[PDB]
Amino acid sequence: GGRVHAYFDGASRGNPGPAAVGWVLVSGDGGIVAEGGDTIGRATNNQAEYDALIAALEAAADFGFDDIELRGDSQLVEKQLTGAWDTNDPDLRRKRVRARELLTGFDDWSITHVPRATNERADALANEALDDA
Ligand SMILES: [Mn+2]
Ligand SMILES: [Mn+2]
């Protein structure tokens, strides 16, 4: 039930190195119903952006929304998720299958690119968690 705008962001300090995720669930009247930031251990930049997507999807599914608008600032996640790009990387393939499994739970979905400054809150959640690692 209901629409949510789900922001997500990864942070990582190596290839791989210490990494974290951040995510924010907004209603349409603009309330932050839930948000999160967590350390995830060692991961690449691209892994952390995916892991933040998946954490956002899991939170939105938990809250039982039926219509999700994903908002993030990772080209690689967007292009792969929408099928514009593919990858050989079996790990990122698995993360896409997981994201798509989660998406199948919503009646409708979308994804939109926002500049990182627009994604400031998810970015702050990820980085504050990472700064504490
Ligand atoms: Mn990002
Ligand atoms: Mn960021």
Centre of ligand 2 from the C-alpha of residue 78, in Å:
15
Angle between helix 45-62 and 120-131 (nearest 10)? 110
Residue 76: give the domain boundaries: 1-133
CA distance 121 to 106: 24
- The binding site for Mn(2+) consists of 9, 49, 73, 123
| Total number of residues shown for the chain | 133
Q: What spacing in Å lies between the alpha carbon of 9 and ligand 2's midpoint? A: 6
Resolution of this structure in Å? 1.4
Q: How far apart are CA 107 and CA 15, in angstroms?
A: 36
> What method was applied to determine this entry?
X-ray
Q: In this structure, what CATH number is given to the domain that contains residue 103?
A: 3.30.420.10
